[PDB]
Ligand binder design. Structure first.
Ligand SMILES: Nc1ncnc2c1ncn2[C@@H]1O[C@H](COP(=O)(O)OP(=O)(O)OP(O)(O)=S)[C@@H](O)[C@H]1O
Ligand SMILES: Nc1ncnc2c1ncn2[C@@H]1O[C@H](COP(=O)(O)OP(=O)(O)OP(O)(O)=S)[C@@H](O)[C@H]1O
Ligand SMILES: Nc1ncnc2c1ncn2[C@@H]1O[C@H](COP(=O)(O)OP(=O)(O)OP(O)(O)=S)[C@@H](O)[C@H]1O
Ligand SMILES: Nc1ncnc2c1ncn2[C@@H]1O[C@H](COP(=O)(O)OP(=O)(O)O)[C@@H](O)[C@H]1O
Ligand SMILES: [Mg+2]
Ligand SMILES: [Mg+2]
Ligand SMILES: [Mg+2]
Lengths: 341, 330, 320, 588
DNA sequence: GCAGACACTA
DNA sequence: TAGTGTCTGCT
DNA sequence: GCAGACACTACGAGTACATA
DNA sequence: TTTATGTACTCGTAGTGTCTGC
């Protein structure tokens, strides 16, 4: 559409120039669609997993997968805590997300799937953000997909499938979606810049865009569009690579941690973290970016880096096992400051 | 039920019907028999592990007091039925207040598995017990005493059911083998004692499964091989071999031995860990730190096994923990 | 079916304020209130078994024996207590016209009042404020912190302490002479030690000893009832060697049929109430014991978890 | 310190809690607050150690000598005894007056009554403390008709004219109900009172006092010069008894505060509950407080003289300190003790105090202040304040205590630091234990509901973190910021979901990737044309906005998601209003 | 702990 | 009208 | 006999508590 | 205020039945 990331998205398996072996595997699966088992696509973020899923649906069902609408279904949990969730439905398939309350994502998996399992001969259900389920929706989904299988099938899209429980991974055909190299990102961006009109001198700037995104199609495409808009559709050799405001704030926090290691610095870090969590930014991604920004500082030796990564792993476990996200991040920053000073 | 007995599990087919058929807790049975013979039965509280004969004892006691029709003379409440404070305020109050409808004796209230009762229900039960103690006795059966209010524990005489000893399990096994015309080797008997862990129900279930295991239930005797194959438990020889390979040989031999032992008969890793722990408690360790390292590391490993994961990694962790702990010896 | 004799707990319940033993000052105050008759609103609190509700009943009986049936309303947790079933009944009783001696008032005994709803207490506030000329209230709860602040403001707080060994011993000897039963001093001290200040527990254990063996000696007493598990857990935590604590745990708890969750909760309570060791040591022990408690609650209840918890206790105690 | 203060008050010496310039002598110990250490040195105040305290008792003669300070204190003490004796026979003469009148009526029950009822304040001059609040209430009530004539538009100097209804709030036992009733009775009004004994839900409030807003007393006509004898003063004692968010009558009482044609008075105990939030700016808030010990001292001297039992005058201060300013409970204590113990003196005061101590639950701020003190974690301090005491202190406000500990555990200067341990190490340990307590808290509040695990959470989240960083607060006790930030984050998540599902079609990216990647790009397609060319790109911005099914409301919502150098609040402000005005109109 | 208001005394 | 003594809310 | 007029039980929604 | 089941309480309402009356 208006954004270039959604303008040139492929709509078919033959329209993909991203992974040849993966596209061949999907063609093999779509060659015999009747015995298609429940799939589970996992890989790094932004590589095009849902593009693969929609292309596979188009290859199995046909054009009309992308002619999709949104309808709202009313779900009632215990007591009268009314919850509104909208399903992005379509002919030949259904799409659901755990975007409901994390502790109330079980009721949608129960009722909606029991309703659509009522009656070519099957309907496909796509579950985005599948790694965000809370071990109860998955527990229901185990028997939900084991019992009803001749009329409903699942394409479970997720990244970093470790939170997915063992039985679900057992009854799901795991499919791995690797990120492209620099050449493939540069080729896709070049196709974008030749389909549209952008003045460019040396393609090294496209290589820099590919480097900055770190194997991310969405980030690279949005960065290319943003840099073209800022440069008035004339990319320069020394064009400044943009970064998200969150990345700038995280880098400033890392510089503050490295420079000053007092307790007033700790309360300033608490304020910055409070703003970041208040502005719709997940805690685990925050901890990962803070860790890999601290490890990119050249003034630290190997002992400090090893202690930082060890505490990062410990507090990542704590974040995965806890709910108050600010507590574990504050503990991690305090431990890192105590280690460095 | 249907088709009378012989279609029941041996757990329910061999439930004691008389206080003389309750083995093990000799002191408890003698004390309650003296209580009912002397005509003074206080508010009893039966505490102990599962399978030790608490509900069997109270059922046999009620049958001895009343007779065959004790079920209509006794209000038995359990966690299966709803036991809110409305129940205490209406059903228990009416049963304690009213006279006997079938005899001229006292009322007996059995609060089976009462550790799953709310605090307010017990608070009401305190006053109910104290008010109507002249013609109504309360019996409380519980596995955990920390879920009972201290006042309720104060109001009730506490009887502790100790885990079944050697003689009681042997006597019940002999009775079952006599009834079923079944044979069993003495080493198989010791293996069943080891697998009992103070639980008679486990003994009965293993006996039933081992009778079903034999190709012909007649003229074939249960051996320790049958017990270990049906229960899946590791043999003591296998545990000793695994421990010797870990403690004496290098990593390749220890890893190969553990993998071979696990894959020969499908042994579980948690069973091997429990057997190894039971063997190592008899060791005369020189250092105080070897015990600490062994206990902490093996507890962490068994916790991770309970949460699930990779069995190969956990087995290698077991070998490494044992070897590293025993490296502190000298 | 044969009838049962009255238990010694209720057979020998005191009927006057002189037979009750324990807090001499509180009982003397109750007897002076008895003589005067102007009994104020009172809250009676303490640990169970030290003579809370029997003192209230004795005071009411001696105050108005002829009218105990008429002008005493004994509501309790067994009875349905709420907002309306309390406000209507207590208001009707307080406004009820009944002719007492000049120094007597109607008594509303709220036995086991710590479980009452807050709104019921709010209504009770104005009930007591309005009808204090005719009726008087007498609460009796184990935990006095449940009663709201204004009620404790409009009441006379009477705190009951656990009885010393001397008072329980005196009552035990009195009941022994009344029952004419043989005993040994060792058995009586064992009964006192097992009771831990609870008179009802002492009476129950003494009656069990008499009815099970006949002679109150140390052997019979320890046969019928075991030593309390808080003490064995306390000496398990305070032992020097790890082997000593391990064998104490195994023999005296695991082979005695004690649940692992009970052992962990008892260890937590002892460590919270433990006093000789330093505060930080207790905090560290509580932290690791709570970790073990979480492991037990999640389902992993074994001997190995308890042994590991004891090993961590010793690794903390020996200072690395 | 407690025992020495008891001996200091044993001889009638005032023990102030703060050091002053007019302070005579200060007893010096070993270590205390640094403010006291710097104050004593500069003002050159007399200092006597404990060794001089022992000889002070023997060397000082009775009555305090003829010193100027001692003489002034004695005559004030004598005046307190003089006014005590003056009013002692006031009721005795009244008692003889009613007895003679009662005897005549019988021809032609007392001394069996609660002491808090017979010794109730007969008039407004018999109250003890809160004189200013009582006079404020009286001035509001006596001038309610004047504000009624002026249609509650303009108030007076005090400002009570605009407020149709007055409100009373304060701790128990200090005399709110008695003051309100006496002010109503003195002016001649007819007291219409409700309470928690009868239902006060919406239905019977609409069917009860609702018709009493503009109706008078039927007894008012038959009780009659009196000008206010035919009106209503609504006295709702125990407003806290309306324990209903919706079915409760708190909003209904707010509607009465909106519209009422007669004076209305409310009496409650705590005002700051979220249940009673709609009473924030509704009524003339008259606050009562714990009265000072002198008035209660005089009243207790009168009572003791009238009851033929004697207590030492200095004991009254300790009795008030024990009961936390609850006068009614003090009278109850006196009545209970006087039955058998007729001598309340220096020997019985300690036993009386430790027997009648009031265990009042603490507020969250007081809980945090008490918990982050370095004295209670010392060797001597922890013996008096055991671990179970700290657990109970947490359990007073267990829902708020861990948050209050986490808010300000690194804002205090530690005094329990281990040798060689820096402040940052202690903060790190406290934060680690706070994280562990958070894990335990998540386990507690889950599907399993392991509520037996509460004391472990108590320790891990409040006691262990505080025992590492306890001491003196550098700043002030701050309320937890997690509640407001959590509400803000939940609202921002709701908006993120709304815009994500508005642009759901055509976008193969979840809500997490919308904020991280898509939203920064939308700013430079929906705000930069406003910045670099102004209104000349009104159609292009609308074209992009309409393409992703984005409305005008979503445009403002997207701008608030940015942080750091990309904050667009100032960018939109700098945009001229003429440029922004056209954008809204064209979309509509 | 940090003010902030209400008193008694000066 | 200005120094202490002391109770009280900060969300 | 039929339509109210009543008091009754029952169901539903909402709030609060959960270790001493 | 968030918290996630289960319990207990309180209230309000809707049916459900029975008693007066004409
Ligand atoms: N002392 C015993 N003598 C004979 N059989 C016993 C004895 N204890 C247990 N059993 C057997 O165990 C079976 C089940 O145990 P029960 O006594 O019914 O239950 P329980 O022992 O009370 O355990 P819980 O606490 O209810 S799980 C009975 O049917 C008996 O066959
Ligand atoms: N001080 C005492 N003197 C004599 N008997 C006592 C005393 N305290 C308790 N008892 C006996 O204990 C039994 C019941 O005591 P209660 O007073 O009913 O217990 P309680 O004080 O009410 O504790 P709770 O909280 O209600 S369980 C009776 O047999 C009493 O005789
Ligand atoms: N200021 C006072 N001076 C003298 N006596 C008082 C005073 N305040 C209270 N009292 C005594 O306490 C009794 C009751 O006081 P109340 O005014 O009912 O207390 P309260 O302010 O209403 O607190 P609540 O309503 O119970 S929370 C009176 O009858 C007096 O005996
Ligand atoms: N073969 C391809 N050619 C062009 N663009 C592609 C290709 N594969 C993926 N993309 C880009 O990837 C984006 C979608 O990635 P996405 O589905 O968000 O990955 P993930 O599901 O892993 O987050 C689309 O905008 C599309 O432009
Ligand atoms: Mg049973
Ligand atoms: Mg009692
Ligand atoms: Mg009042």
């Amino acid at each position: 559409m208006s954004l270039w990331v959604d303008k040139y998205r492929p709509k078919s398996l033959n329209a993909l120039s991203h992974n040849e072996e993966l596209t061949n595997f999907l063609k093999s699966l779509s060659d015999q669609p009747r015995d298609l088992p429940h799939l589970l696509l996992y890989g790094p973020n932004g590589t095009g997993k849902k593009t693969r899923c929609m292309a596979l649906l188009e290859s199995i069902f046909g054009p009309g997968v992308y002619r999709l609408k949104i309808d709202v279904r009313q779900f009632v949990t215990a007591s009268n805590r009314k919850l509104e969730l909208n399903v992005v439905s379509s002919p030949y398939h259904l799409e659901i997300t755990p975007s409901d309350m994390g502790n109330n994502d079980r009721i949608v998996i129960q009722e909606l799937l029991k309703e659509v399992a009522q009656m070519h001969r099957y309907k496909c259900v796509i579950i985005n953000e599948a790694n965000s389920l809370t071990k109860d929706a998955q527990a229901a989904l185990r028997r939900t997909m084991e019992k009803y299988s001749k009329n409903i099938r699942l394409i479970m899209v997720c990244d970093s499938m470790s939170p997915i429980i063992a039985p679900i991974k057992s009854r799901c055909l795991l499919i791995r979606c690797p990120a492209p190299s620099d050449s493939e990102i540069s080729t896709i961006l070049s196709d974008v810049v030749t389909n549209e009109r952008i003045q460019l001198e040396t393609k090294d700037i496209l290589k820099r865009i590919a480097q900055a995104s770190n194997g991310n199609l969405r980030v690279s495409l949005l960065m290319l569009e943003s840099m073209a808009l800022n440069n008035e559709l004339a990319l320069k050799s020394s064009s400044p690579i943009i970064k998200p405001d969150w990345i700038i704030v995280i880098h400033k926090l890392t510089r503050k941690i490295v420079k000053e290691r007092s307790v007033n610095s700790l309360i300033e870090c608490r304020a910055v973290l409070y703003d970041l969590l208040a502005h719709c930014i997940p805690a685990n991604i925050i901890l990962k970016e803070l860790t890999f920004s601290l490890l990119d500082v050249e003034t630290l030796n190997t002992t400090n880096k090893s202690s930082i990564i060890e505490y990062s792993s410990v507090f990542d476990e704590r974040l995965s096992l806890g709910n108050k996200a600010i507590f574990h991040l504050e503990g991690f920053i305090a431990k890192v400051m105590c280690c460095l000073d | 039920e249907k088709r009378s007995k012989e279609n029941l599990p041996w757990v329910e087919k061999y439930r004691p019907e008389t206080l003389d058929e309750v083995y093990g807790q000799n002191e408890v049975i003698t004390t309650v028999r003296k209580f009912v013979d002397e005509g003074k039965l206080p508010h009893l509280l039966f505490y102990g592990p599962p399978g030790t004969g608490k509900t069997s004892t109270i059922v046999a006691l009620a049958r001895e007091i009343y007779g065959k029709n004790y079920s209509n003379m006794v209000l038995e409440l359990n966690a299966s039925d709803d036991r809110g404070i409305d129940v205490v305020r209406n059903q228990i109050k009416d049963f304690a207040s009213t006279r006997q409808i079938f005899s001229k004796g006292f009322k007996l209230i059995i609060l089976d598995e009462a550790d799953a009762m709310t605090n307010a229900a017990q608070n009401a039960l305190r006053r109910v017990i104290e008010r109507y103690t002249k013609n109504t006795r309360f019996c409380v059966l519980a596995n955990y005493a920390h879920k009972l209010t201290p006042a309720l524990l104060s109001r009730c005489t506490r009887f502790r059911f100790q885990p079944l000893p050697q003689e009681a399990i042997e006597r019940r096994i002999a009775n079952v083998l006599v009834h079923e015309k079944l044979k069993l080797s003495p080493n198989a008997e010791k293996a069943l004692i080891e697998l009992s862990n103070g639980d008679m129900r486990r003994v009965l279930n293993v006996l039933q499964s081992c009778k079903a295991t034999l190709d012909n239930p007649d003229e074939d005797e249960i051996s320790d091989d049958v017990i270990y194959e049906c229960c899946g438990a590791p043999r003591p020889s296998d545990l000793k071999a695994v421990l010797k390979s870990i403690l004496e040989d290098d990593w390749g031999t220890a890893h190969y031995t553990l993998n071979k032992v696990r894959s020969a008969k499908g042994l579980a890793l948690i069973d091997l860990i429990e057997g190894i722990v039971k063997i190592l408690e008899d060791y005369e360790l020189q250092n105080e730190e070897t015990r600490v390292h062994l206990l902490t590391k093996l507890a962490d490993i068994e916790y991770s096994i309970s949460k699930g994961g990779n069995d190969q990694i956990q087995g290698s962790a077991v070998i490494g923990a044992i070897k590293a702990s025993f490296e502190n010896e000298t | 079916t044969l009838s049962l004799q009255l238990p010694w707990v209720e057979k020998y319940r005191p009927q006057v304020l002189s037979d009750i033993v324990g807090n001499k000052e509180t009982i003397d105050r109750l007897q002076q209130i008895a003589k005067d008759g102007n009994m104020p609103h009172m809250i009676i609190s303490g640990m169970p078994g030290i003579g809370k509700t029997t003192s209230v009943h004795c005071l009411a009986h001696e105050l108005l024996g002829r009218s105990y049936a008429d002008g005493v309303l004994e509501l309790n947790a067994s009875d349905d207590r709420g907002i309306d079933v309390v406000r209507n009944q207590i208001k009707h009783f307080a406004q009820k016209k009944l002719h007492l001696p000049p120094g007597k008032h109607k008594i509303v005994i709220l036995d086991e009042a710590d479980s009452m709803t807050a709104g019921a207490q709010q209504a009770l506030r104005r009930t007591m404020e309005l009808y204090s000329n005719s009726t008087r209230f007498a609460f009796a709860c184990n935990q006095s912190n449940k009663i709201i602040e204004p009620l404790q403001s409009r009441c006379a707080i009477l705190r009951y302490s656990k009885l010393s060994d001397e008072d329980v011993l005196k009552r035990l000897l009195q009941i022994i002479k009344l029952e004419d039963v043989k005993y040994t001093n060792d058995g009586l001290e064992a009964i006192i030690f097992t009771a831990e200040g609870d008179m009802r527990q002492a009476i129950n254990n003494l009656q069990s000893t008499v009815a099970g063996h006949g002679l109150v000696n140390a052997d019979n007493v320890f046969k019928i009832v075991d030593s309390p598990h808080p003490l064995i857990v306390k000496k398990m935590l305070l032992a020097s060697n790890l082997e000593d604590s391990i064998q104490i745990l195994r023999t005296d708890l695991w082979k005695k049929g004690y649940s692992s969750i009970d052992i962990v909760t008892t260890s937590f309570r002892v460590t919270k109430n433990l006093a000789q060791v330093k505060e930080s040591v207790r905090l560290e022990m509580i932290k690791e014991i709570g970790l073990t408690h979480m492991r037990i609650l999640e389902g992993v209840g074994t001997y190995l978890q308890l042994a590991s918890m004891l090993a961590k206790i010793h690794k903390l105690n020996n200072k690395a | 310190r407690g025992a020495s203060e008891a001996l200091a008050k044993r001889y009638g010496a005032r023990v102030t809690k703060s050091i002053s310039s007019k302070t005579s002598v200060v007893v010096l110990g070993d270590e205390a607050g640094p403010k006291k250490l710097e104050k004593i040195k500069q003002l050159k105040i007399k200092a006597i150690d404990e060794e001089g305290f022992k000889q002070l008792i023997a060397g000082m003669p009775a009555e305090g000598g003829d010193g100027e300070a001692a003489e002034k204190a004695r005559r004030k003490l004598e005046e307190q005894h003089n006014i005590a004796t003056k009013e002692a026979e006031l009721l005795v003469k009244k008692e003889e007056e009613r007895s003679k009148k009662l005897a005549a009526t019988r021809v032609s029950r007392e001394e069996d009554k609660l002491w808090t009822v017979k010794y109730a304040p007969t008039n407004l001059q018999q109250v003890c403390g809160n004189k200013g609040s009582v006079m404020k209430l009286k001035n509001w009530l006596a001038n309610w008709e004047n504000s009624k004539k002026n249609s509650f538009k303009h108030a007076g100097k005090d400002g009570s004219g605009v407020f149709r209804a007055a409100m009373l709030y304060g701790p128990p036992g200090i005399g709110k109900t008695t003051a309100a009733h006496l002010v109503a009775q003195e002016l001649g009004y007819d007291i219409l009172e409700q309470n928690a004994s009868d239902v006060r839900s919406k239905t019977l409030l609409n069917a009860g006092v609702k018709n009493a807003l503009d109706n008078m007393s039927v007894v008012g006509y038959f009780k009659h010069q009196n000008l206010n004898g035919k009106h209503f003063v609504i006295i709702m004692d125990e407003v806290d008894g309306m324990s209903g968010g919706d079915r409760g009558g708190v909003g209904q009482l707010a509607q009465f505060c909106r519209k009422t044609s007669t004076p209305l008075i409310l009496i409650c105990n705590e005002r700051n509950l979220p249940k009673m939030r709609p009473f924030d700016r509704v009524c003339l808030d008259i606050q009562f407080r714990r009265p000072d010990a002198n008035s209660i001292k005089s009243r207790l001297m009168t009572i003791a003289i009238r009851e033929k039992f004697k207590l030492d005058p200095n004991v009254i201060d300790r009795l008030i300190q024990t009961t936390r300013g609850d006068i009614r409970q003090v009278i109850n204590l006196l009545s209970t003790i006087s039955t058998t113990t007729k001598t309340i003196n220096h020997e019985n005061i300690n036993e009386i105090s430790k027997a009648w101590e009031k265990n009042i639950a603490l507020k969250p701020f007081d809980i945090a202040h008490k918990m982050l003190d370095g004295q209670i974690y010392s060797d001597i301090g922890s013996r008096n304040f055991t671990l179970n005491d700290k657990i109970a202190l947490y359990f007073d406000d267990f829902d708020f205590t861990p948050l209050m500990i986490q808010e300000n555990y690194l804002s205090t200067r530690p005094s329990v630091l281990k040798p060689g341990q820096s402040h940052l190490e202690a903060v790190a340990e406290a934060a680690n234990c706070i994280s562990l307590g958070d894990i335990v808290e998540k386990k507690i509040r889950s599907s399993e509901q392991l509520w037996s695990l509460l004391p472990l959470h108590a320790v891990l989240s409040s006691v262990y973190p505080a025992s590492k960083v306890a001491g003196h607060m550098a700043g002030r006790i701050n309320f937890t910021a997690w509640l407001g930030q959590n509400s803000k984050s939940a609202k921002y998540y709701r908006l993120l979901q709304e815009i994500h599902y508005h642009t759901r079609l055509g976008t193969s990216t979840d809500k997490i990737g919308l904020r991280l990647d898509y939203l920064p790009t939308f700013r430079k397609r929906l705000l930069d044309p406003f910045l670099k060319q102004g209104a000349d790109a009104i159609s292009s911005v609308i074209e992009v906005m309409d393409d992703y099914y984005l409305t005008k409301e979503d445009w403002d919502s997207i701008m608030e998601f940015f942080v750091g150098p990309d904050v667009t609040t100032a960018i939109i402000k700098k945009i001229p209003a003429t440029v922004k005005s056209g954008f809204t109109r064209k979309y509509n």
